[PDB]
A paper describes a structure:
The engineering process to develop specificity for the RAS sequence QEEYSAM involved extensive modification of the Bacillus protease, subtilisin BPN’16–24, a canonical serine protease in which the scissile peptide bond is attacked by a nucleophilic serine (S221). The nucleophilicity of S221 results from its interactions with the catalytic histidine (H64) and aspartic acid (D32) that together form a charge relay system.
Based on this analysis, as well as earlier engineering work, we designed mutations in the catalytic region, the S1 pocket, and the S4 pocket to create a nitrite-dependent (D32G) protease and an imidazole-dependent (H64G) protease. We compared these structures with the crystal structure of Protease1(N) in complex with a peptide corresponding to its sequence specificity (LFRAL, right). In both cases, a catalytic amino acid is mutated to Gly and the vacated space is occupied by a network of conserved water molecules in the absence of the cognate cofactor.
Numbering used by the authors:
A (entry chain B): 276 to 280
B (entry chain S): 1 to 74, 84 to 275
């Protein structure tokens, strides 16, 4: 998944 | 911006503001959790959601998109914000959603894309999307990652890890690398990313930390640059930012160093 950094 | 943050001054944005440049007529796409368009200090010009469980891009049930949007405006008060929802409230999203948001941004003639998001893996399709955006003239900026260090290994996340994307790491108010900020030869520049005060959903304000916070400083800086030099290509904007950065140390940790928008926009 992509995730907010 | 109604919440005072040191980061705006650290990157030398007030110098552009004093020259009369505030990022007017620059379309910035904020790819993330949405933007709370009801916030009194944020105007959102358009947008789209690609998160099937969260269909409204003009709300933000995470807080991060709203915060990021605010930082872009703190740096470039006249920029036009677009809310492109590719992550849900828990900060997570599917690869394909991100790609959809990038495609949307290209099709809608965005000038700048900000991606405060990352994964340890990307995809050939994601690479193609960002490379297409760059070929189309878009300035493409991403947070470098919050994966700290891993010895000699790069810890830069995708999409920041792709060469066509500007990879932005985080420093604190003293220009020290934040302990969480990802590292590697793919880092390009640094910007403020520790305890940055900005807008939160529901008309609120507060400090957050992350490479997510550093990326919008650079996206906003790109808007300032484009306001002073609307004919510069994305290549020229990127070169301006990297070539005039304030060197901070070893490029594995700091890239070219801290952005200096005053110098970049000369
Ligand atoms: Na508003
Ligand atoms: Na990159």
């Amino acid at each position: 998944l992509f995730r907010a950094l | 911006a109604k919440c005072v943050s040191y980061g705006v001054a650290q990157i030398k944005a007030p110098a552009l503001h004093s020259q009369g440049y505030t990022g007017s007529n620059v379309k910035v796409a904020i790819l993330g959790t949405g933007i709370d368009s009801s916030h009194p200090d944020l105007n959102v010009a358009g947008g789209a959601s690609f998160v099937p469980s969260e269909t409204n891009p003009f709300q933000d049930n995470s807080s991060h998109g709203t915060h990021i949007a605010g930082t872009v405006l703190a740096v470039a008060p006249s920029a036009s914000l677009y809310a492109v929802k590719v992550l849900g409230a828990d900060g997570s999203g599917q690869a394909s959603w991100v790609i959809n948001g990038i495609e949307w941004a290209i099709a809608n003639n965005m000038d700048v894309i900000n991606m405060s998001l990352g994964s340890p893996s990307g995809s050939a399709a994601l690479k193609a999307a960002v490379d297409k955006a760059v070929a189309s003239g878009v300035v493409v900026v991403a947070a470098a990652g919050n994966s700290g260090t891993s010895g000699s290994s790069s810890t830069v996340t995708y999409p920041a890890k792709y060469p066509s994307v500007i990879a932005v790491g985080a420093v604190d108010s003293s220009n020290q690398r934040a302990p969480f900020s990802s590292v590697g030869p793919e880092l390009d520049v640094m910007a403020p990313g520790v305890s940055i005060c900005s807008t939160l959903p529901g008309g609120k304000y507060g400090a957050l930390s992350g490479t997510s916070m550093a990326s919008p400083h650079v996206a906003g800086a790109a808007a300032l640059i484009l306001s002073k030099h609307p004919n510069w290509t994305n290549t020229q904007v990127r070169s301006s930012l990297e070539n005039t950065a304030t060197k901070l140390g070893d490029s594995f940790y700091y890239g070219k160093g801290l952005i200096n928008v005053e110098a970049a926009a000369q």
